Design a protein around this ligand. Structure first.
Ligand SMILES: [Mg+2]
Ligand SMILES: [Zn+2]
Ligand SMILES: [Zn+2]
Lengths: 76, 1338, 99
């Protein structure tokens, strides 16, 4: 279990849009449209999204780039 | 669901009411009581409201869903779903137009003053005792004349025609339809243009505004009278069948039945053409019935059937606690919730909680079903239910797996502050009790004596993220009130650690050298060495001294085994020194503080857990207990008591002879008994404290004892010196009911036995204490509710307003010393402007920077004394505050994040701690220079720096330019040292008469009597040669009847006769001797400069009074402008003082009552807002005259005094936010864009001035004056009307919003809560911001 | 005592109060204030509508939870509609506007 979220709030200092980006990621993960970029250890999708945020792989801009890439991909 | 906004409220027109209604309810009957089908035309009717059962008609001809619009021919009920019976309203056609009680009886009777007729007359009309002539045509009678019976008779007989009069609500409706809004409106504007007088102009402007509101809103006044009356849907006024063939119905059913009865009887009587008297009686009766329906209780209080209690009307349902908003719209009853008793559970981690299996299964049932179906163990949901009801191993495995990371919310009944709800990860356990982590109990104020807690489950993903991020225990370690840690170890932990760290002079293994802690533990667990024994150990501490690198320093220290054992846990960054000491409560708290400041959060959490575990373990190994012999009665108690008794006997006998009053003997006895108590206390502490005389190799020695009760005292685990005294000494003095102190104390203690009297007294004490705590809790709760209510809507909206303004904050040095230093006072505040070193052009802090610990320490290294810092009150942002003006302080360390609701956190932080609520010479304590502030002295002949200013202060500059001590020196106090002199410790710097304020002469010469005639106004009572007298120059009030206008005076003339003039001024010194002018030095003694002329001899309620800004009944008087004050027209009944400005115009007169004594002379130099009379000042004057920063400093200091007296630390920012919310309003003094007198918020004034001055045209150029309003009215004047209606008088606000046609965009938090959408705060701010972009865009 | 889901009340479709019938805990105004001190908007929102007052919302949420998805559809609380109906029973026209 993630006993502290200190690194995630240190990544984005607002501490609120952190929740939004993590919700977007965990929503792409739950409804199985996407796949986790980190090897899961039988964690649920919330702690997976926090673990992804704390490693610097995912933020809002990465979400935006991946969404627009998927949009143009399915557009063709 | 649509995305909507703007809930609109207005008067309902009768045609709209007809529109809503589906049918007329003609008979009051409901059901046949034989066949339970409803009545054909009754309060419950299928053809009007709906079918009882889904999709089937009453007679039972049509029952299938296939039919959806058909209306059965037999029973005119349409076939649809019974849910519609929940929304269909009915209506009743009243024969006589009836008045709406709300618009009549509401304190400002809007029908009343709209018609310009007093309420008394309208009441006279409603009860049908007298007429009123409404538009009586071309006669000699006015238009609002009330007419009695026989006045109507003589008028009618005299005036057959040109006589129009009518009665009742129909007459009132006639009056309402015929009113010309605009003509009267313009007439009123002309009248206001012609009239100049305060009160009439205010009533006229209110009325004109009312008329404008009606003509703008589009409501016609006649609608206040009802013709058709709607009836609520049946399911909202149920007729439930009680088990046992009996039924239960609300009283509203009874009231409706009565109304229908009176309506039908009036209809039939009208059809019968009954005489007028009877129809009038029936109309009156219908009035009572209807007004009982709307609001029962404003009349003869129509009680209910066989219950003697007044039955509940609609208004009762809406208003009040039990009724609505509080109960069902702010006080709901959630699902997925539980309750149970709390228990210790020491083995838990700080971030987890023990949860019983069975409740967890019950709560998470649907999750279990979902996962079971996902894994395919069950085909369908019923099979999942059966699998849960068998409870096989697979079910428990799935439950363990699902519970894994899902967090739950724990709440304890009195949620005082935001720490009343916290999230934990549950661990399944046996038993029926909830296990709560010990460290958090302090936060909950939880005790294990039958307290219960509730447990909620967050469902959605956002809720999970919110619980783990914002609410988790580890994220909330700092209290939101002050920055200090909340989770400090409480009692067992500190006792164990204390036992571990204390050392003993001699034990086993004294002075052996250990290579590390591991062999120390080897030794202790094997019993080859004591847990505390002085030893030299090699230790490698780590220090991050470089730029984040850890450097190991390894040396030999002399310590105890226990301190090493503790050292095993301690993380790298901390100095060894920390543990080297006794390690009590304070030491542990500051240890945690340093651990947090150096390393960070995660190490602090793990270190706290380790501390708890080790403390519990070694406390258990210690085996500390408490036996009867452990508390030693001091041997010399009895002697001290017998001596004090002999002394009391001698003083009483010396009283019986009558050389001393009763009060003096009382004081002496009380003081000698207090001294004896102190003596016994000191003897007990000496006996008990250092009694362990244990032996080293040879001779003996003594050391701080290991007496268990002593360790409990000294460690700070439990008990204070007072309780130690109460256990082993005499338990001091007691207070009788009235507060007076009993003469004989309680000499016995609980180890001994008391007797009846002493017990009885202490019983009284404890009883009073308990009752106090009860009432204190009730009052606290109420106060905090008001606080949270007023400040709810304030939100952080902008990032930075960019203002340079701020308040200059200094350390509050109350009298003797520095109660609170600067560093803590400024930490986490942004600066208003760069501060310079004590040498100019040495900038220490750039423009606004957040002052974190490093800056504060840097300021400590220098000698900055006062710092101007940006405050929330001066923030420039409109409709909220900016991050910078607020600062950082939080449970986290960083600058405040945009969106946080600081109002609610401030209110909670102020509320929760609220449950425990001669003078001859000055003596400088530390060697420093003396400095006088706000004084203008004149050295006399005696060689004294004569004080001629009433506002004189004497501060103390230290070596490095800092004010340590500060005193206020009054007029006439003898001084010793002037300026520059260094004063030794405790040296007398000042002198003055306790019961005497002398009047000081500036020049010399002979005292000349002017208008000082003997006998008329003064009575010569003079003493003998030595020159004593009692010449009394009386004041204006006390002057005799003949000497009423003749004012005796004393002119100071010289030896030749000419009045010597004050140096530099031409004024002839003509001293009008004030009231009680005791002229001791009679005529014949050359006056020296300084001859005397006249000798002149908390808690919760206080906080509530400060916050309600109540004038304290004897306010001091102030100066408006500066300059020479002067007297004026004398003895009119209130003596006149006219302030004469040296430059400005004179004509400012202030009356003063006779009893008031003035401290300042006429020819004195006043400053604006300077004291003229002594006493407590009401905040209004200080705010109005001195301005914002003065009043805010006054309030903050006055509250902080009460709070610090109890030792509860609160940061000023919360009080600042409240104060800023208090003064939101201003009053306009100039003109240009407003109505020249309207109370308007300072926000609208600032935004409109910013607009106007931004516009190229100058426009209003308006100047405004600030106003200070008390929290109750301020909350009452909020913009949104739903917020106000939520808790105030529902009738009043509802009527105001209905008549005004007000439109609520909801804009706030509480409105959004009520509507059940996302609050604009915190996680939802972005959402609202998105919606914000949708409005006013493309 | 604990409850997940059970019987609801007749007039205001809130869960029964009491212990004989399952009955839920009272989330009072002080607790609301506590939540407001945090930025906890979605938890409070669901607690206010989906957990107690929204009929369609509660059934949709039950089905959604069973399906292994965790979303919500807040809608408007029935008690608010009751409030509207009671105020409309007086002579006061209060309408929900739209644009
Ligand atoms: Mg308890
Ligand atoms: Zn039918
Ligand atoms: Zn600002």
């Amino acid at each position: 279990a993630r006993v502290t979220v200190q690194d995630a709030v240190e990544k984005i200092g607002n501490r609120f849009d952190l929740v939004l980006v993590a919700a977007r990621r965990a929503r792409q993960m739950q409804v199985g449209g996407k796949d986790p970029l980190v090897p899961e250890e039988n964690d649920k999708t919330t702690v997976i999204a926090l673990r992804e945020i704390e490693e610097g792989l995912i933020n809002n801009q990465i979400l935006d780039v991946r969404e627009r890439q998927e949009q143009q991909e399915q557009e063709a | 669901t649509e995305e909507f906004d703007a809930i609109k409220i207005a008067l309902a027109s009768p045609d709209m009411i007809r529109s809503w209604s589906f049918g007329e309810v003609k008979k009051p009957e409901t059901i046949n009581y034989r066949t339970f089908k409803p009545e054909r035309d009754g309060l419950f009717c299928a053809r009007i409201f709906g079918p009882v059962k889904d999709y089937e008609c009453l007679c039972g001809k049509y029952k299938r869903l296939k039919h959806r619009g058909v209306i059965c021919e037999k029973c005119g009920v349409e076939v649809t779903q019974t849910k519609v019976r929940r929304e269909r309203m009915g209506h009743i056609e009243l024969a006589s137009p009836t008045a709406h009680i709300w618009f009549l009886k509401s304190l400002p009777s809007r029908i009343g003053l709209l018609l310009d007729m007093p309420l008394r007359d309208i009441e006279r009309v409603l009860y049908f005792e007298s007429y009123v002539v409404i538009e009586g045509g071309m006669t000699n009678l006015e238009r609002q004349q009330i007419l009695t019976e026989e006045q109507y008779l003589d008028a009618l007989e005299e005036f057959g025609d040109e006589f129009d009069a009518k009665m009742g609500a129909e007459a009132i409706q006639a009056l309402l339809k015929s009113m010309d809004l605009e003509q009267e409106c313009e007439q009123l504007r002309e009248e206001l243009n012609e009239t100049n007088s305060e009160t009439k102009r205010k009533k006229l402007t209110k009325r004109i505004k009312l008329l404008e509101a009606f003509v703008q809103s589009g409501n016609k006044p006649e609608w206040m009278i009802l013709t058709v009356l709607p009836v609520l849907p049946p399911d909202l006024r149920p007729l439930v069948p009680l088990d046992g063939g009996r039924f239960a119905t609300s009283d509203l059913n009874d009231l409706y039945r009565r109304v229908i009865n009176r309506n039908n009887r009036l209809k039939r009587l009208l059809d019968l053409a009954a005489p007028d008297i009877i129809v009038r009686n029936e109309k009156r009766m219908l009035q009572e019935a209807v007004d009982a329906l709307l609001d029962n209780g404003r009349r003869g209080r129509a009680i209910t059937g066989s219950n003697k209690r007044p039955l509940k009307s609609l208004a009762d349902m809406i208003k009040g606690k039990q009724g609505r908003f509080r109960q069902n719209l702010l006080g709901k009853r959630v699902d997925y919730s539980g309750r149970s008793v709390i228990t210790v559970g020491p083995y838990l981690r700080l971030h987890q909680c023990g949860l019983p299996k069975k409740m967890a299964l019950e709560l998470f049932k649907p999750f279990i079903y979902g996962k079971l179906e996902l894994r395919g163990l069950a085909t369908t949901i019923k099979a999942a239910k059966k699998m849960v009801e068998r409870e096989e191993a697979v079910v428990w495995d799935i439950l363990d797996e699902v519970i894994r990371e899902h967090p739950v919310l724990l709440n304890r009944a009195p949620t005082l502050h935001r720490l009343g709800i916290q999230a934990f990860e549950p661990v399944l356990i046996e038993g029926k009790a909830i296990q709560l982590h010990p460290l958090v109990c302090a936060a909950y104020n939880a005790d294990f004596d039958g307290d219960q807690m509730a447990v909620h489950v967050p469902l959605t993903l956002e809720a999970q993220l919110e619980a783990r991020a914002l609410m988790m225990s580890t994220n909330n370690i700092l209290s939101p009130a002050n920055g200090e840690p909340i989770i400090v170890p409480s009692q067992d932990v500190v006792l164990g650690l204390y036992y571990m760290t204390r050392d003993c002079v001699n034990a086993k293994g004294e002075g052996m050298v250990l290579t590390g802690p591991k062999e120390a533990e080897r030794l202790y667990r094997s019993g080859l060495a004591s847990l505390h024994a002085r030893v030299k150990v090699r230790i490698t501490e780590y220090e991050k001294d470089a730029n984040g690198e850890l450097v190991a320093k390894t040396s030999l220290k002399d310590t105890t085994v226990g301190r090493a054992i503790l050292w095993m846990i301690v993380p790298k960054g901390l100095p060894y020194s920390i543990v080297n000491q006794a390690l009590g409560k304070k030491a542990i708290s500051k240890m945690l503080n340093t651990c947090y400041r150096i390393l960070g959060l995660k190490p602090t959490v793990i270190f706290a857990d380790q501390i708890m575990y080790t403390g519990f373990a070694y406390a258990a190994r210690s085996g500390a207990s408490v036996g009867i012999d452990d508390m030693v009665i001091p041997e010399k108690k009895h002697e001290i008591i017998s001596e004090a008794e002999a002394e009391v006997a001698e003083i009483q006998e010396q009283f019986q002879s009558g050389l001393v009053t009763a009060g003096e003997r009382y004081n002496k006895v009380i003081d000698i008994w207090a001294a004896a108590n102190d003596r016994v206390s000191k003897a007990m502490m000496d006996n008990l404290q250092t009694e362990t005389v244990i032996n080293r190799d040879g001779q003996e020695e003594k050391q701080v004892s290991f007496n268990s009760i002593y360790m409990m005292a000294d460690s700070g685990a439990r008990g204070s010196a007072a309780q130690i005294r109460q256990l082993a000494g005499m338990r001091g003095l007691m207070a009788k009911p009235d507060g007076s102190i009993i003469e004989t104390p309680i000499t016995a203690n609980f180890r001994e036995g008391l007797n009846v009297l002493q017990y009885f007294i202490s019983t009284h004490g404890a009883r009073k204490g308990l009752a106090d705590t009860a009432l204190k809790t009730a009052n606290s709760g109420y106060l905090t509710r008001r606080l949270v209510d007023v400040a709810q809507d304030l939100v952080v909206t902008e990032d930075d307003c960019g203002t340079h303004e701020g308040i200059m904050m200094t350390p509050v040095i109350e009298g003797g010393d520095v109660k609170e230093p600067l560093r803590d006072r400024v930490l986490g505040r942004v600066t208003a402007e760069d501060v310079l070193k004590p040498g100019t052009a040495d900038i220490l802090v750039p423009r606004n920077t957040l002052l974190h610990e490093q800056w504060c320490d840097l300021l400590e290294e220098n000698s900055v004394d006062a710092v101007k810092v940006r405050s929330v009150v001066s923030c420039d942002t409109d409709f909220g505050v900016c991050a910078h003006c607020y600062g950082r302080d939080l449970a986290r360390g960083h600058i405040i994040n945009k969106g946080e609701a600081i109002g609610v956190i401030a209110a909670q932080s102020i509320g929760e701690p609220g449950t425990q609520l001669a003078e001859s010479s000055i003596q400088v304590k530390n060697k420093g220079s003396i400095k006088l502030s706000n004084v203008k002295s004149v050295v006399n002949s005696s060689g004294k720096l004569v004080i001629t200013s009433r506002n004189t202060e004497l501060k103390l500059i230290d070596e490095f330019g800092r004010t340590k001590e500060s005193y206020k020196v009054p007029y006439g106090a003898v001084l010793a040292k002037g300026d520059g002199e260094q004063v030794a410790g405790g040296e007398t710097v000042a002198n003055w008469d306790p019961h005497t304020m002398p009047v000081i002469t500036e020049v010399s010469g002979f005292v000349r009597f002017t208008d000082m005639i003997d006998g008329q106004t003064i009575t010569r009572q003079t003493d003998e040669l030595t020159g004593l007298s009692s010449l009394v120059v009386l004041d204006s009030a006390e002057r005799t009847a003949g000497g009423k206008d003749l004012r005796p005076a004393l002119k100071i003339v010289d030896a030749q006769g000419n009045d010597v003039l004050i140096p530099g001024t031409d004024m002839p010194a003509q001293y009008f001797l004030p009231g009680k002018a005791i002229v001791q030095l009679e005529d014949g003694v050359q006056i020296s400069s300084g001859d005397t002329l006249a000798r002149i001899p908390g808690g919760l309620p206080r906080v509530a009074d400060l916050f309600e800004a109540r004038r304290p009944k004897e306010p001091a008087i102030l100066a408006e402008i500066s300059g020479i004050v002067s007297f004026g027209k004398e003895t009119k009944g209130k003596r006149r003082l006219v302030i004469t400005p040296v430059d400005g115009s004179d004509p400012y007169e202030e009356m003063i009552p006779k009893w008031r004594q003035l401290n300042v002379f006429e020819g004195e130099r006043v400053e604006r807002g300077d004291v003229i009379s002594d006493g407590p000042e009401a905040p209004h004057d200080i705010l109005r005259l001195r301005g914002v920063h003065a009043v805010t400093r006054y309030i903050v200091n006055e509250v902080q005094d009460v709070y610090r007296l109890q030792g509860v630390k609160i940061n000023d920012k919360h009080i600042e936010v409240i104060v800023r919310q208090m003064l939101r309003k201003a009053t306009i003094v100039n003109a240009g864009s407003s109505d020249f007198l309207e109370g308007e918020q300072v926000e609208y004034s600032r935004v409109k001035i910013a607009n106007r001055e931004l516009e190229a045209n100058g426009k209003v150029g308006a100047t405004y004056s600030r106003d200070l309003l008390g929290i109750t009215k301020a909350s009452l004047a909020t913009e949104s009307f739903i917020s106000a209606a939520s808790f105030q008088e529902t009738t009043r606000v509802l009527t105001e919003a209905a008549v005004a046609g007000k439109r609520d965009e909801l804009r706030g938090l509480k409105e959004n809560v009520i509507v059940g959408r996302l609050i604009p705060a915190g996680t939802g701010y972005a959402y609202h911001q998105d919606r914000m972009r949708r409005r006013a865009a493309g | 005592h604990a409850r997940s889901t059970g019987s609801y009340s007749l007039v205001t479709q809130q869960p029964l109060g009491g212990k004989a019938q399952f009955g839920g805990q009272r989330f009072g105004e002080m607790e609301v204030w506590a939540l407001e001190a945090y930025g906890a908007a979605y938890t409070l929102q669901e607690m206010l509508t989906v957990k107690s007052d929204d009929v369609n919302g509660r059934t949709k949420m039950y089905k959604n939870i069973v399906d292994g998805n965790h979303q919500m559809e807040p809608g408007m609380p029935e008690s608010f509609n009751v409030l509207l109906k009671e105020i409309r029973s007086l002579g006061i026209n209060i309408e929900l506007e739209d644009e």
